[PDB]
């Protein structure tokens, strides 16, 4: 391409002539040193570049090269189990090459490995009429996930030559004669981060996702292709919640994005995450994970790009038909990069210094995730389920980022550090928190469990909300101020609080709980509910009901420790209630 010329360097703003071929948002290698930059505005041939790196020592006369594309990512073999920043720089690789612990100015390195040999295995025969999103072969990439090589968007023709063999992601692997002529297909494809990947159709995410975590799967569930937002107050075991989702969830891959977190706090994600063990294989969770890392120290473009690069990757795996989970923490630091970006662009500010198009950026992001039909003849169904942390400065609701996230996303798990002080883990506030998929999950859950699950969950919610009703009254006067009818109900909910809601991420059995086990534990406390209410109504008194049932209620405390193999262990609680209740008829 044409080499441009610096004509002005004012702070982080660079002017350059000859930039007549470049487009808007095209990424640039500004100056001799060749630092990263983006074309913001053009006048004639003069381009105006935002440079996101120390511009010191850059003067006029120096060259400016365009990469020839907007911010993109390289997609292909060598992408899973990798650690990138928001602009997809290989952090491992960077060290080995620079022989340095520091991110040097204007050093440029290919995102993936262009020199790694892979076994490309052809799965489509020559003379095949192809279109975008069609599978031409596969690479067994990790110990878990199989990389399905796909037809890039734009190409449509016929396969002339296809062989199985060992090639780099730079070697041609295919020859397709299009309406233009010969176009060789390679192992990697590229894609602008800010533009969402095409799909055949968007469908309602209706399939709930098994997260194993009780309070979530039961009361505030997210479907495969749904979105949830989490406050991040300190000491509320947020990382623990994140990790549990990251492993127990029946998604094929995990994409984690660190937007722009505290240095030492960012290192915790780097250390902890690889040491997560995949529940099913026993292999490292990395083998099905792409991770993005960004200190606040990182170039603002990278901090802003963070969630976009993340979801662009998340989409490229969705097109393969997999279920993907995208986690970002926090999206507040991201929004904080947008705010700075807005400031540097001299725009009219929106609310509290954020750009006026903040809600639009969020909608642009959270609507790229869902249940889809990918391109290609197969009409395969993929999905991206989005999990986003928010850290609202002084931990607040009012703040715009939170409010706009909550305006477009469906599920809200509200972590509360007062419930963490009470030693209630996971720390989700059962009153504040909510899921819109609730009444939709009833449809799918009653169908697949042949039971009245929806009738059970929404009843438990009448009980837990009525607990807070009574806890306002109990704290108001004394205790005896309630007749046995209220006094029963206060313990029923306490049984839910300690025997169903409280779940330990570390205990070999309690760490995960499937559908049946969940259904059961939910029922066997609900079986206690109706039975004792009929007991109290016909003369029998509060104290009588309680002091003696201790044999089963201290065995109800154990429900969360029964192995999955031992199904009928809890199912047999439905019997011991009907007997001990009959003992109080004597």
């Amino acid at each position: 391409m044409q080499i441009g010329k610096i004509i002005k360097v004012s702070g982080p703003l660079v002017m350059a002539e000859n930039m007549s071929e470049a487009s808007i948002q095209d990424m640039c290698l500004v100056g001799d040193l060749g630092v990263i930059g983006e074309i913001i505005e053009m006048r004639q041939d003069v381009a105006s570049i935002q440079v996101y790196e120390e511009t010191s020592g850059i003067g006029p006369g120096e060259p400016v090269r365009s990469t020839g594309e907007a911010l993109s990512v390289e997609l292909g073999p060598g992408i899973i189990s990798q650690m990138f920043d928001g602009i997809q720089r290989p952090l491992d690789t960077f060290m080995e090459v620079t022989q340095s612990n520091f991110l040097g100015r204007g050093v440029q390195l290919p995102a993936l490995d262009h020199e790694k040999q892979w076994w490309f295995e052809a799965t489509i025969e020559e003379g095949t009429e192809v279109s975008a999103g069609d599978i031409i072969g596969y690479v067994d990439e990790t110990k878990i996930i199989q990389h399905k090589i796909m037809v890039p968007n734009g190409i449509k023709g016929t396969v002339q030559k296809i062989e199985s063999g060992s090639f780099t992601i730079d070697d041609p692997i295919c020859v397709i004669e299009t309406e233009q002529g010969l176009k060789e297909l390679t192992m990697m494809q590229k894609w602008p981060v800010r533009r969402g990947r095409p799909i055949k159709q968007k469908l309602n995410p209706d399939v709930p996702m098994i997260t194993g975590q009780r309070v979530i799967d039961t009361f505030f569930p997210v479907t495969k292709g749904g979105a949830a937002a989490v406050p991040g107050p300190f000491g509320a075991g947020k990382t623990v919640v994140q990790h549990q989702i990251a492993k127990w969830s029946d998604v094929d891959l995990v994409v984690y994005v660190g937007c722009g977190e505290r240095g030492n706090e960012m290192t915790d994600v780097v250390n902890e995450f690889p040491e997560l063990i995949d529940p099913n294989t026993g292999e490292s969770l990395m083998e099905r994970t792409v991770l993005i890392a960004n200190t606040s120290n990182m170039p603002v473009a990278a901090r802003e790009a963070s969630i976009y690069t993340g979801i662009t990757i998340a989409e490229y795996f969705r097109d393969m038909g997999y279920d993907v989970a995208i986690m970002a923490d926090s999206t507040s630091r991201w929004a904080e990069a947008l705010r700075e970006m807005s400031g540097r662009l001299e725009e009219m500010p929106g609310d509290e210094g954020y750009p006026a198009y903040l809600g639009s950026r969020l909608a642009e992001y959270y609507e790229r995730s869902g249940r889809v039909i990918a391109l290609g003849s197969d009409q395969r169904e993929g999905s991206i389920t989005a999990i986003s942390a928010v850290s609202p400065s002084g931990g607040d609701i009012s703040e715009p980022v939170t409010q706009n996230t909550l305006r477009v996303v469906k599920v809200f798990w509200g972590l509360d550090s007062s419930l963490a002080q009470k030693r209630h883990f996971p720390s989700i506030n059962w009153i504040q928190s909510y899921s819109l998929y609730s009444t939709e999950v009833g449809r799918y859950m009653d169908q697949i469990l042949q039971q009245d699950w929806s009738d059970m969950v929404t009843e438990g919610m009448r009980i837990l909300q009525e607990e807070e009703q009574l806890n306002e009254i109990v704290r108001l006067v004394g205790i005896d101020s309630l007749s046995d009818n209220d006094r029963l109900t206060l313990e029923v909910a306490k049984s839910i609080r300690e025997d169903y809601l409280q779940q330990n991420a570390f205990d070999d059995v309690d760490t995960f709980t499937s559908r049946e086990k969940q259904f059961n534990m939910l029922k066997v406390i609900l079986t206690f509910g109706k039975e004792a209410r009929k007991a109290l109504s016909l003369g029998a008194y509060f104290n009588e009901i309680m002091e003696g049932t201790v044999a089963v209620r201290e065995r109800i405390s154990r429900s969360k420790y029964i192995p999955e193999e031992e199904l009928a262990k809890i199912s047999s609680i439905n019997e011991e209630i009907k007997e001990t209740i009959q003992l109080i008829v004597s």
């Binding site: 808007i24 006026a356 198009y357 809600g359 909608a363």
Partner: protein, 451 residues
């Protein structure tokens, strides 16, 4: 077609060497790769034309691109087959059927109704909701909005009014124009579900605009629907009703564009012209002398942080002919829909009450139920302030009345229709709880008629 793009600055683009380009004109942009983008002419001066592109100017090469100047502002291709169809904010075949062959193209800004040519809103629309039919009566032609908040069930109510809406004469020429402004794909799909489940589709045009759709498409959305609405109301001559969701989502887009154009932000961050811009939308509602069939509008807005003195609800309030309020306190009690009738009001209500349109008694029942429910709330107030013994026997009954008024009267569920007759019948029934002496707001002859 001009191949002379001089500047791009953000979403704004400057094209020189042009001729006879008009303000507000539509453009299209042919990019060097082949992509096509719609746009507006903001400001034209000399041989220059400054334009804003809807889908943004992202990834455009200036040298190797071109602009086509359509010679006409925003336009909707209108046809009577639009019924049962779904279009986007720009009004294109979104539902996959046979492509529409439009009778004509109307500019979406339409035109102002001559005040003398204007016919005053008269008669009655059966909404299906007691709190709107009886105490804040919607009258064909009127503007009557819904005042809400986040997570409140306005979406449920929008879906309900669209179904239960119909006239009390020839129901045959009744239609409903529904506009989705900046809502999520799953919010859209919900409305697609309730429409193709009860078949309200078979009498409705739909304009589905999304949260991630370009902001300028969000602005256009209501103007398309209203162009579609006036066309069906005068041209085809139908009593047309218009529903538009999250007016707040409209304003969010308005201030977003306003800021993109570097416009001076008015009160609370919204543009100084917020009042007027909304008026070019709401005043489109009404009737015309001699022309059979009318346009009535039901806009929906979520009040930011429940604040009524916020620009959105306030400036809408300053335009519309009344308001319908949905409160947290009533949705908290499980009342569906959560309509607080105390802060609500329909101004032109008296033009859809009395014999012929509804029933002769309408007037007294409305004004007795209010005067009572008010005092019943004042009683409910001192009930747990100075103990429930401080309010006497005269007070106590009224408090029991307000209690049955919400549970049984205002609450009716989002899936059970109520006709005015049923509304009046149930209305008198709740009223029965009071002695004939305390029922002073009603004269004698209206009383002896209702068991």
């Amino acid at each position: 077609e001009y191949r002379t793009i001089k500047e791009v600055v953000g979403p704004l683009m400057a094209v020189e060497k042009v001729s006879g380009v008009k303000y507000e004109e539509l453009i299209e942009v042919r990019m060097q790769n082949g992509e096509i983008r719609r746009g507006q002419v903001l400001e034209v001066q000399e041989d220059k034309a400054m334009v804003q592109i809807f889908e943004g100017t992202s990834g455009i090469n200036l040298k190797n691109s071109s602009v086509r100047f359509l010679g006409h502002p925003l336009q909707l291709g209108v046809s009577e087959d639009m019924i049962g169809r779904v279009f986007d904010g720009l009004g294109r075949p979104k539902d996959n059927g046979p492509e529409i062959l439009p009778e004509k193209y109307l500019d979406i800004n339409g035109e102002v109704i001559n005040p003398i040519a204007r016919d005053y809103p008269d008669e009655f629309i059966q909404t299906g909701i007691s709190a709107i039919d009886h105490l804040n009566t919607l009258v064909r032609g009127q503007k009557l909005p819904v005042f809400s908040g986040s997570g409140l069930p306005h979406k449920e109510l929008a879906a309900q009014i669209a179904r239960q809406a119909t006239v009390l004469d020839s129901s045959d020429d009744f239609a409903v124009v529904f506009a989705a402004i900046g809502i999520t794909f799953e919010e859209a799909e919900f409305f697609m579900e309730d429409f193709r489940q009860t078949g309200a589709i078979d009498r409705s045009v739909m304009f589905m605009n999304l949260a991630n759709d370009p902001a300028i498409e969000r602005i256009a959305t209501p103007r398309m629907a209203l162009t579609a609405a006036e066309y069906l109301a005068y041209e085809k001559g139908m009593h047309v009703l218009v529903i538009m969701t999250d007016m707040t989502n409209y304003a969010e887009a308005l201030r977003e564009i306003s800021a993109a154009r570097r416009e001076v932000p008015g009160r609370r961050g919204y543009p100084g012209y917020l009042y007027t811009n909304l008026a070019t939308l709401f005043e489109r509602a009404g009737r015309i002398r001699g022309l059979k069939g009318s346009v009535t509008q039901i806009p929906i807005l979520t009040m930011p942080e429940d604040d009524k003195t916020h620009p959105i609800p306030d400036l809408t309030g300053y335009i519309t002919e009344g308001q319908i309020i949905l409160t947290r306190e009533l949705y908290k009690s499980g009342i569906q829909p959560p309509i607080d009738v105390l802060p609500s009001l329909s101004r032109l209500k008296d033009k859809g009450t009395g014999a012929g349109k509804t029933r002769e008694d309408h007037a007294a029942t409305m004004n007795q139920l209010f005067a009572a429910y008010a005092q019943g709330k004042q009683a409910k107030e001192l009930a747990v302030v100075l103990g429930e013994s401080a309010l006497s026997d005269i007070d106590k009954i009224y408090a029991k009345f307000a209690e049955r008024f919400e549970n049984e009267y205002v609450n009716q569920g989002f899936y059970t229709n109520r006709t005015i007759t049923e509304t009046l019948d149930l209305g008198w029934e709740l009223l029965a709880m009071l002695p004939r002496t305390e029922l002073k707001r009603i004269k004698d002859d209206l009383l002896d008629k209702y068991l």
